[PDB]
A paper describes a structure:
Our structures reveal that both phosphodiesterase (PDE) and mART domains of SdeA make extensive contacts with SidJ.
Intriguingly, the N-lobe of SidJ KD and the canonical pocket of SidJ, which is implicated in the catalysis, do not make any contact with SdeA. Accordingly, the canonical pocket of SidJ also does not contain any bound nucleotide. A key hydrogen-bonding network involving Q851 of SdeA, the backbone carbonyl of E860 of SdeA, and Y732, N733 of SidJ positions the glutamylation target residue SdeA E860 in the migrated pocket of SidJ.
Numbering used by the authors:
A (entry chain B): 3 to 94, 97 to 129, 138 to 146
B (entry chain C): 100 to 848
C (entry chain A): 231 to 506, 510 to 590, 758 to 853, 858 to 904
The structure:
Amino acid sequence: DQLTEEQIAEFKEAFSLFDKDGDGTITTKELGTVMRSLGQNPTEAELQDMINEVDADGNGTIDFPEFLTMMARKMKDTDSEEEIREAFRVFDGNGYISAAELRHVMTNLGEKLTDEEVDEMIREANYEEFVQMM
Amino acid sequence: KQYYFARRGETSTHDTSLPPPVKVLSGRSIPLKEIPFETTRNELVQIYLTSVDQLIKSNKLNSIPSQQIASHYLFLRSLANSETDGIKKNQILSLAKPLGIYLASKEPHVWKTINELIEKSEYPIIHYLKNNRAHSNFMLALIHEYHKEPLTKNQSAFVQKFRDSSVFLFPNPIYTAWLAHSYDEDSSFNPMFRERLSTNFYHSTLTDNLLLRTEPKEVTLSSEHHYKKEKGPIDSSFRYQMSSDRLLRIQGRTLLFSTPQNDVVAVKVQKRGEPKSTLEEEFQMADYLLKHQSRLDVYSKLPQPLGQYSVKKSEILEISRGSLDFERFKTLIGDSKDLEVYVYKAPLTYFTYLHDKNQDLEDLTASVKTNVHDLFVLLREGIMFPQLADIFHTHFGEDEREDKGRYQALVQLLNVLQFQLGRIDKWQKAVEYVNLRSSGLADLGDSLPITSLFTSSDFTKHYFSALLTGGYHPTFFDKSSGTANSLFTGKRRLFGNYLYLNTIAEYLLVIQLTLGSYGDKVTRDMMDKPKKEAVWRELANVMFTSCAEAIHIMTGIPQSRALTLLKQRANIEKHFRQTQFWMTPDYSKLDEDTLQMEQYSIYSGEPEYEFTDKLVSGVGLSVDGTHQDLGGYNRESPLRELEKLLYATVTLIEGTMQLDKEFFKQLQQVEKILSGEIKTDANSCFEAVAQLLDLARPRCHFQKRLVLSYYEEAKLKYPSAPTDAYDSRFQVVAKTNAAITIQRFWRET
Amino acid sequence: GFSLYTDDTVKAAAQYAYDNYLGKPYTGSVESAPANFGGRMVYRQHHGLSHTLRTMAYAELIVEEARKAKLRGETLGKFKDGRTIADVTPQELKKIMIAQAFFVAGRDDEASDAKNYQKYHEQSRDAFLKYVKDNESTLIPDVFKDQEDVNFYARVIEDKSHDWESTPAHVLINQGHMVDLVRVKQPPESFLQRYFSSMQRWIGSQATEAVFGIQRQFFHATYEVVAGFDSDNKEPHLVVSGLGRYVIGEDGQPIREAPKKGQKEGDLKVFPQTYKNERLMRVDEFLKLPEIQNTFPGSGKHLQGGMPGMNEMDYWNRLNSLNRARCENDVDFCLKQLQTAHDKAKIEPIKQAFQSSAKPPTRLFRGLNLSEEFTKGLIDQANAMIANTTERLFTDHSPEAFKQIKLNDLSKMSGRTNASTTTEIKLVKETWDSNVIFEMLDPDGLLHSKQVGGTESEFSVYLPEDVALVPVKVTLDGKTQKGENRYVFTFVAVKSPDFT
Ligand SMILES: [Ca+2]
Ligand SMILES: [Mg+2]
């Protein structure tokens, strides 16, 4: 599996940000935007699928439990070797760049790590090799 | 399932059906006039542009400190990036060009710093002023130096109220972005200008300048809301067999009765002076919150109401006879041969107050979390509680004061010429019977709909007459037109926003006084100074976490991040020290020298608390001589980090909301370009997307991921466009996005 | 203007020098034992945080007394051009204070060895340059004009030569460090006189007395042992210039050279060597020779050397108290102590210049919109009356201060009616925004004021004719909304029975 807590905090901040009147329900007009803001930019038909499935009465509004269930059912087979390859390729370029730049960026970009965590991951490692050795 | 029955929106004004804006003095009816904010601000910005032109054509440019020329240049670049008209934008850039030339010549290191701020942001002045450079009003200095033609009276008033910083003249998106980034980790901004004589504090002017830029709020309650939907009356199909063989105690006017199921049946008898409407209102609210508890996701244990009816005063006074305070009770209840009683079934912890000293700090933390969560969840639902506790200021002229003696947590916003938070009169008797309990909230009867803050209700007309009637002072009186002009009268259009923020601040103030009462009652039995300091330190942690939970519930900002933003602005160490010092009588034993020497420590980098009244021994500061006050008579409250924490909380909530408004106002402008509805050059589209990048919440990444996706689509529309100016910031965004999607992969396993 | 106490820049430099150099244990095995005051460790007890902060305050006070001495028409020194310490600007003084924060940052012990001396001074220069290289952002634009500027200050820190008497920055940074080490050297009558004659060359007698009086009050403020001057001590006089002695030749008369045009000139300096008579000269006889009595006030005048009050019983445990270590380990605390001391040293010369002396408020502000020519003619009189009350150290000054105060009829605009004042400076600025603010101080309730009931914080004051208002300090606090200078005068109420 289920979604973590640092994902739930981000989902809740996004859902709260795109709920413009603050009644805990987002319209379908900004469901596409709140899903693009989360790195899930789907086709018009892919969004229409959930427009029909989620809204089975025509209410046109999603509650945060419904949004969480939808976003977890979407994230079943979306992250893969392609995602990891793009993630590693943005840093690199033949397949190995550096272990120093990695340790630098994993503590200054995003939800920063710690020395023990980074080193352990560095010890667990060759970008593609480390990405396919886990 | 889970959603709120209230929804926010914008209205035209709140200035409908208000007391007419007149001041009656000696038979003269002085009219009160508003000074328009966003028009005087623009007039002063245009006077600033004229002054910059005069500075350039006067060749005195070398006689300006090179950090003020850097400030002028970065402001001109930000201001030209905020303009949408080509002519004004190009005039501003023609003004900023000679300054850039002079800086590239004279100060090449300052120029190398500027050029790196500029390739990072569209408003590079907000990142230049995240430090003590904000306390220098370069715009107003330049206006005073070269615009020798006199300012009008409205511009003079704007200068007077916002004399401290130069950010009080930025347009709305730049000011909102600067205010939100002031709370960033890499910021050293503190709204305190310690000069040689005065040490001006202006943490309130930040929220004052933020609120005068907002649009009047309006909350619309749904049709099935408690204060809209009507339910049938209450039928006395249930009577409770009151038996003194089970009476536990008499709490106020409530008779508690034991239960074989370990619950407690409370019988709340009608007080002297209240009608049956109040008791049936509490019955209805309890039934409502029981019906809609899983929807609102309320944490409290709620009092399950059983009935509401009338009983013979004989039965009440015969059940109540076998007790201790039986006489006191007999004076509270009403005088009638039949009394209205409301009977509910609550758990035992419902009747233990929150400041009760028989609960360990773990249980106190859990209970304060429950109470804060439910208070703000019900504020999101449209229900406010104006009487959590009877906090008062200056009981002396209570009935004849504009505030009716009631304590205003944001007194500087809701009044003219009021600069600090005032004394709390008997701060402990004020929370003695607070409505916060070990189980959650209590006394849900004296609630109110949130819409009573945005309208001229009886609550609003009673306690906030100064705000609703406009401000007067002999110095506002324009002796020519015979009307008192003020920036404060404009708040008549917006008085609901001020009252919303004041409700949040007073919730937090009640939480703080409850925690302080707990600490003062639990450390009196201890002489081990380390343990007393540990108690007060954990209470400061509880207070800061409660304010962070308020921010999280209102705005959506994660609680950890809101806590970090708070701790940037208010010092938790000085808060723990000042609460321990002033919320205990131990400072009454110290003489003058030790008192001053300990204030040197608890204030730590700012002036001390000066009071000229005599300390009653064993008590502390007191005007009556038996109960302790928080502050001297006619002076401010000595809890300064509490005031800063309250203003940081309300400024964070309101500034986050306003920045989300600016962000979506710019995002729809961006999307009108990537669909052909506005055909412009590539520079216009890239400037739009980059401004959209400059309006995202500090340290919020999904907003930057959204802006990055828009930038990719903009590149897909203008293929051969030169992006040498914007590739850097979006490269950083792509890098941090890759870092995030890596961390989440490894951290999972 | 600029003040050491409220700057957050010199305070940041001092916090850096403490967390990196002045709060680190000594490693030189020479007086490197860290003391333990109360329960707190103090590593550098002779050249620590307290010492550097007192040296900064000495620089500030020296330039203030120089400015004050220029007003009453003194003849000061010359720094190779028409200039003196009276002409140091606040930016130059801020640079000097940033330099003084590291002057003893690179030490490892209290060794006076020349090689150790130069090593420590160049390490201090390196620490200063490293701090500037670290925080170059807010140092070169405003504080330090050029990089040659930082190099000049780092070269005056390293002190390769001994050209202390070259430029105002040299004189300040070196006197402030040498005049502080006057409570530790054992013979006070010689070190005090040497520093007195070395500083009065630049400023003057009446101002050096003030510098040393406020120095003793700083010592009291920061819990330091205060020496006691005594012009009848029999300890052998040591010449602080170098380290030598004075021997009298065979009857009672000191051995003196035979230079040109005069057989009565510079005393002959003798290193410690044999005697026999060839006996040394004590500080008593040294302080009463004709060439030193007519230039040093302390000749024939004594000091108690301690608190006026508390005896040695609790004096020792107040010096060895816990707040001394806190003053040695908190920049905020030591700065607050020095600030209080300087404020009281600014006020008390007035109280001692006169004879002995709901709740009433202490500080009352009263705005006024006056002319510009009149404001200049007012600031002139106020500064001319402020620059006649120096904190005398040896000689109690005169009733001349009283007569000048009574002859200066500036106090007529400050009272003679029922003035409408307030206890908020923001209220004076955000209602009338006057250009001439009078701040009247009521230290002990001598100002009969009553609240009038934001007109709740407002008061009405009536000045009794037996109480006078004397100016403490003129100021300048920006510009009013009408675009004009705003001068914040400051007065103090004193019971003056002689003003009938
Ligand atoms: Ca909605
Ligand atoms: Mg009052």
